[PDB]
Amino acid sequence: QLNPESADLRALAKHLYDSYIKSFPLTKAKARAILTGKTTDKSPFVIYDMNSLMMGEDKKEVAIRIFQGCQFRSVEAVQEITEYAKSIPGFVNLDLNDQVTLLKYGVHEIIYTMLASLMNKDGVLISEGQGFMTREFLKSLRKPFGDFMEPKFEFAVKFNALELDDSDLAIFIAVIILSGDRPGLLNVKPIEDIQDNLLQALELQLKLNHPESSQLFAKLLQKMTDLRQIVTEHVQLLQVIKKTETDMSLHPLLQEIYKDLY
Amino acid sequence: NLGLEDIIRKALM
Ligand SMILES: *c1ccc(C#N)cc1-c1cc(=O)c2c(F)cc(F)cc2[nH]1
């Protein structure tokens, strides 16, 4: 029914969506527009192999340095999420220690959600959208770099096939931040109260926006399980790096590309 | 992570 309680849940979805637009300049729509070839101004250049990697050149341990470079390039991402989170009603009133825990775990899952926006089944956008690195070229790289991205492409293709838009993703991301099961939380009940209300608004938003999917609410919450998995897969990745004593050599151009991913 | 939580704390300010 259209009543005060629903109107408020549509008011929250709007407030979130507007905040989401202010915080995050690269929308999914902007990103999708580039992948499907709609942009004719300075179209992205494809890197699909070694020879094309040299041509695209004009625009510690190797693994540790890739990871430090991508964290530094992710500082602006972390800041924009924190800004987004401060606009979620009730967030700034939570224990300051808990705000940090929510965000310290949320960021990685949210960055993978946005990274899916940059991926299709052929590859991924890089260099602020001036490059397109193929999925098969990444998979073809030597161990252990060859396996870095391929679990994320598999996740990203399912997620993208649900056809969420920026309105959907704003509430989704707000559900991710206000997760009451993070380790170290002190006052779970106020976090869950917020999340419960955010889930009501997410449910409604998916009913009005996605008639073609009767269990899309369920399937989207399942995708939170899969996001945490990629995050745990990175920890394993660090152990595979420690044990590795094969030549960890990698073209400096590939290291720069990899500093653009996550 | 210690740097990460440091970035977050500065942002929340
Ligand atoms: C950055 C650049 C490329 C890759 C790959 N493959 C991974 C990163 C990166 C670095 C980092 O410190 C991370 C985390 F601390 C937590 C994560 F869930 C992912 C992550 N990815």
First-residue to last-residue Cα separation of chain A? 42 Å
Number of strands of chain B: 0
Percentage of residues in helical conformation of chain A? 55-70%
Summarize the helix and strand pattern of chain B as letters: H
Q: What is the chains' assembly state?
A: heterodimer
> What is the CATH class designation of chain A?
Mainly Alpha
Strand content of chain B: under 5%
Principal-axis shape of chain B equals: elongated
Instruction: Tell me the β content of chain A.
Output: under 5%
Largest two-chain interface = A-B, 13 and 9 residues
Number of domains of chain A: 1
Bound molecules: ligand A1CAA
Give me the Rg of chain B, rounded. 6 Å
> Terminal Cα separation of chain B, in Å?
19 Å
Structure classification of chain B: mainly alpha
Which structural class fits the helix and strand makeup of chain A? Answer: mainly alpha
Kindly report the spatial arrangement of strands forming the biggest sheet of chain A. Answer: 1-4-3-2
Radius of gyration of chain A: 20 Å
Q: What overall geometry of chain A do the principal axes of the alpha carbons give?
A: globular
Description of the structure:
By secondary structure, chain A is mainly alpha-helical. Chain A has one domain: Retinoid X Receptor (Orthogonal Bundle). Chain A contains twelve helices and four strands. Chain A has helices spanning 4-23, 28-35, 50-55, 62-72, 75-86, 96-117, 135-140, 150-161, 166-177, 188-209, 216-243, 252-259, and strands at residues 45-47, 119-120, 123-126, 131-134. Chain A has a four-stranded mixed β-sheet with strand order 1-4-3-2. In chain A, helix 1 runs antiparallel to helix 5 (75-86) and helix 9 packs antiparallel against helix 10. The longest helix of chain A has 28 residues, at 216-243. Chain A starts with a helix and ends with a helix. By secondary structure, chain B is mainly α. Helices cover 77% and strands 0% of the residues of chain B. Chain B contains one helix and no strands. Chain B has one helix at 2-11. Classes of the chains: A mainly alpha (262), B mainly alpha (13). The interface between A and B is small, with 13 and 9 residues. The ligand *c1ccc(C#N)cc1-c1cc(=O)c2c(F)cc(F)cc2[nH]1 is lined by residues 66-67, 70-71, 108, 148-149, 231, 234, 258, 261-262 of chain A. Chain A: There is a cross-link at residue 22 (Glycyl lysine isopeptide (Lys-Gly) (interchain with G-Cter in ubiquitin)). Chain A: Belongs to the nuclear hormone receptor family. NR1 subfamily. Chain A: It is found in: Nucleus; Cytoplasm. Chain A: Residues 1-50 are annotated as: Interaction with FAM120B. Chain A: Its main location: nucleus.
